Design a binder for these strands. Structure first.
Ligand SMILES: [Mg+2]
Ligand SMILES: [Mg+2]
Ligand SMILES: [Mg+2]
Ligand SMILES: [Mg+2]
Ligand SMILES: [Mg+2]
Ligand SMILES: [Mg+2]
Ligand SMILES: [Mg+2]
Ligand SMILES: [Mg+2]
Ligand SMILES: [Mg+2]
Ligand SMILES: [Mg+2]
Ligand SMILES: [Mg+2]
Lengths: 117, 76, 51, 177, 136
RNA sequence: CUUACCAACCCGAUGCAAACUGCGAAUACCGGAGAAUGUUAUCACGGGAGACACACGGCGGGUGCUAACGUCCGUCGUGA
RNA sequence: CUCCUAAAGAGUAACGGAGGAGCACGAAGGUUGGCUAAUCCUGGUCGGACAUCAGGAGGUUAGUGCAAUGGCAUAAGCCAGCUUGACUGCGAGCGUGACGGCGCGAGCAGGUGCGAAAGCAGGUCAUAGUGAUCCGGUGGUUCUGAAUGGAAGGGCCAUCG
RNA sequence: UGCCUGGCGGCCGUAGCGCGGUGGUCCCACCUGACCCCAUGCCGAACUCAGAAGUGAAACGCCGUAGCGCCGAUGGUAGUGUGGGGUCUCCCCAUGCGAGAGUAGGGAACUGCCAGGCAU
RNA sequence: GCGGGGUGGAGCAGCCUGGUAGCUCGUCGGGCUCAUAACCCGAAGGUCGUCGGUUCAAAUCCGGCCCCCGCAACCA
């Protein structure tokens, strides 16, 4: 029983609900070394904005690329990248991860940066 | 021992077939289980009655990895 | 045929009340719930009383 | 972490050549030691099960986990959900500091010692053996003994076969009759 | 007398007996008794025809019975009016369609198999014919 | 220890099912569009009813014995 | 009430074939978070065909307060935390009935619970668990009050037999 | 532009399973540590945090392979609407529709958005 | 066609209200007696008519079938 397939099972219900609501969701993927963030169109097939720690434009200004304060950088970056693009209200898709620690630090940072969710 | 009992028929089944134009709230299908599943603009009642949540034409589709039948409203 | 009918009287001054059932053999403790009182239009606590 | 340190330096490179492994990750490991105490008779009185688990708590320093009946069976006249026995699983160094505590103290204590068996393997590389007496451990004092209940000990290893399984515990000098 | 050891229900609808049969070729032995008519085969008729063939070849070779009386037939007793529920099960039948292979035989010469099948056909209510195993 | 016999599971082959389905028609039914045809043949409201013992025939069935000019439903036709 | 008869929409009879109900539950309801069976094999103190432990096979053959059917992995199954939406007023629009009725329901107002939030909640996987009217009881009530002020009685609302 | 990886989809087995091979700069996975945030009805297994010594063993991805699954004609057959007929419990003819199973065969998915790496 | 019963060897409880087999006799063993009965003392014997379903669990519940006891079998 891989931890991944058990995690997609945890994320399926919320994603179906967001798909039914027709909302533009902020997807978050978390690895032991990196953290990722995507804003998907309501149709679920277009990536509007994206930000992560594998981008050197953000990675160079971090001590370690996979700790809690690194997630706050991606949260701040993905929000201001989306605000100027025109998206203001989204829905946070924790995607099977517990809303705690790094993904929580990513969320409130994006919430602090002016993304309404 | 002895037979001779039965219950009243419940008038289940599809009420609006594919392509029919419906108003918001129209019952589409009455069913015991979810033989049909709610798609876009379609709600599921407490007895799994599928009703239109918006005006338009009803549409039957089979989707998903389990090949389940869905009913949606093409809003028009 | 064991559940007895009871009424839940609002803690507010109004005489409004709900009605429900209760198995007084297994649950001898009085039932207390927060329910909406339509007279004062607030959620007050409702205590059990005889029907 | 005595044998834990003894693991990563000594038993790895003798095993690495013994089976000619390509990567160090192929060598078997020891994940957890789980001690089971099937009381069975606690249905008569449950005052004896808490002190029964009090013993298992002293053997490993962990508060035990009371297991419940998975299903009702009348052959032993229990309904599903009854407290039937306790268990403790040990991981990390608490497993190690216990793993040496028996192999160097748990071995030289059992009455009429004759050595462990080499056939008591699961078939995929995991060992299990049961001790009949609980007064074999230094923790549990002989003075305080209400009963002589034993317990089972199983060894969960990442080994794939019994040959790789027996080879690992043999490296820890396990008594093999 | 062949009969299901147990059944999900005790009584069945009368039904109909349309269509052609499945299992229209000799599959186990070398010779077969194929039904060309349509009708029912009670368990007694099947047993009677089996004994006639079993004794015909003096208990030699192998004999298969390709049919099985799985349909229960009810009857109302005498001096009983209509209604008051379905009758009680009295015997079991196997529905036969044209082309159904009823019995198969092996281990005996053909000339002996024809006489054995001829003796058995005299016990059955449907017209039959002799068939032999063919290369599919 | 080897021994009149019975034999689960599995595998291969063969059937059966109103209350079995990993399949699946013809029809029928619902909706949309389009002509032609039909004395609006359709719906609603109002005045007046009668009728609520049906019969046989065809087809699909239950029941009975695939018995009955039997019995009970579905559907069509005729008698009424 | 459930299945079949019932003829692939609905409906459809018989002293036709089979079974159930006249309840239960303040959690077995709401929500958030998590979880995934049956059976069997192997190894293992007492311990046995069957207890708890470990591993593999298996893939729902399990489970669902209860009959059957239809459902159920996003679980509707299992566990924990916090809780009372088992809310009040309404209700577009449908379903089903000769009728009395019965059923589904987005959304709106007020107030509330859970959640970081999107959201979810007007009882329970769904379909049985029920009884019209009259008469009378109990509580409430900016209704009425046979000259007038009260009261009795009546009405209205909630509820009981 | 090509190769490679990650995320989100479309699609829902021609896409699955097995068997064989193969991949670590990056990515991913395992991994390291755990006082603390947080977590175990016991257990840092899981969840979570702090990290980067090691390893691609497992897992995952990729490549091959017809062992199984899966897909699947053409023709015939069954059934059947309408009309007619017979020896009428069942059939036949005209006409329209036409399976299921099986056979030949197919088949080791396809594809969109974004991101990163690498070559270019 | 409807109701009630089949439990140690014999006659009966228990079933209703699921878990726990009881009573009197007889039988076996030992005593008292010259000996037997009576008597005193101790002990065994049923897996509940059979097959199947419900339950963790069946003498008990719910079937079907083997059986015995009944009552009813009417108007022509
Ligand atoms: Mg009448
Ligand atoms: Mg009439
Ligand atoms: Mg009629
Ligand atoms: Mg007639
Ligand atoms: Mg129908
Ligand atoms: Mg509200
Ligand atoms: Mg809050
Ligand atoms: Mg239910
Ligand atoms: Mg007055
Ligand atoms: Mg870790
Ligand atoms: Mg075909």
């Amino acid at each position: 029983m891989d931890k991944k397939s058990a995690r997609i099972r945890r994320a399926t219900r919320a994603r179906r609900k967001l798909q039914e609501l027709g909302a533009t969701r902020l997807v978050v993927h978390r690895t032991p070394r990196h953290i990722y963030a995507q804003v998907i169109a309501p149709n679920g097939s277009e990536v509007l904005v994206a930000a992560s720690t594998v981008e050197k434009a953000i990675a160079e200004q971090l001590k370690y690329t996979g700790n809690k304060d690194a997630a706050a950088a991606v949260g701040k970056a993905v929000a201001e990248r989306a605000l100027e693009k025109g998206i203001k209200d989204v829905s946070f898709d924790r995607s099977g991860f517990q809303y705690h620690g790094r993904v929580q630090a990513l969320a409130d940072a994006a919430r602090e940066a002016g993304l309404q969710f | 021992t002895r037979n001779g009992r039965d219950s009243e028929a419940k008038r289940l089944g599809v009420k609006r077939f594919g392509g029919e134009s419906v108003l918001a709230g129209s019952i589409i299908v009455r069913q015991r289980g979810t033989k049909f599943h709610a798609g876009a603009n379609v709600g599921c009642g407490r007895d799994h009655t599928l009703f239109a949540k918006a005006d338009g034409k009803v549409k039957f589709e089979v989707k998903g990895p389990k090949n389940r039948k869905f009913i949606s409203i093409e809003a028009e | 045929g064991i559940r007895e009918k009871i009424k839940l009287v609002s803690s507010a001054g109004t005489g409004h009340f709900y009605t429900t059932t209760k198995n007084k053999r297994t649950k001898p403790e009085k039932l207390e719930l927060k329910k909406f009182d339509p007279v004062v239009r607030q959620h007050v606590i409702y205590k059990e009383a005889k029907i | 972490a005595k044998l834990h340190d003894y693991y990563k330096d000594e038993v790895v490179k003798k095993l690495m050549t013994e089976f000619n492994y390509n990567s160090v990750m192929q060598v078997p490991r020891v994940e957890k030691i789980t001690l089971n105490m099937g009381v069975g008779e606690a249905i008569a009185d449950k005052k004896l099960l808490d002190n029964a688990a009090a013993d298992l708590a002293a053997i490993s320093g962990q508060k035990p986990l009371i297991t419940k009946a998975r299903k009702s069976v009348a052959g032993f006249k229990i309904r599903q959900g009854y407290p039937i026995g306790c268990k403790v699983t040990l991981r990390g160094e608490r497993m190690w500091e216990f793993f040496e505590r028996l192999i160097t103290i748990a071995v030289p204590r059992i009455r009429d010692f004759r050595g462990l068996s080499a056939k008591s393997f699961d078939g995929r590389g995991n060992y299990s053996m049961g001790v009949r007496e609980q007064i074999i451990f230094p923790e549990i004092d002989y003075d305080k003994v209400d009963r002589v209940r034993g317990l089972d000990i199983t060894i969960t290893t990442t080994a794939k076969s019994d040959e790789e399984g027996r080879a690992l515990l043999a490296a820890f000098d396990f008594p093999f009759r | 007398m062949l009969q299901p050891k147990r059944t999900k229900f005790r009584k069945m609808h009368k039904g109909r007996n349309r269509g052609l049969a499945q299992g229209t070729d000799v599959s186990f032995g070398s010779f077969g008794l194929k039904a060309v008519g349509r009708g029912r085969l009670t368990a007694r008729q099947i047993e009677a025809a089996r004994r006639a063939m079993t004794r015909a070849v003096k208990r030699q070779g192998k004999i298969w019975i390709r049919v099985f009386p799985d349909k229960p037939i009810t009857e109302k007793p005498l001096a009983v009016r209509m209604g008051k529920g379905k009758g009680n099960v009295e015997y079991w039948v196997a529905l036969i369609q044209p082309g159904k292979v009823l019995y198969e035989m092996d281990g005996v010469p053909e000339e002996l198999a024809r006489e054995a099948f001829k003796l058995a056909a005299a016990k059955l209510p449907i017209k039959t014919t002799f068939v032999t195993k063919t290369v599919m």
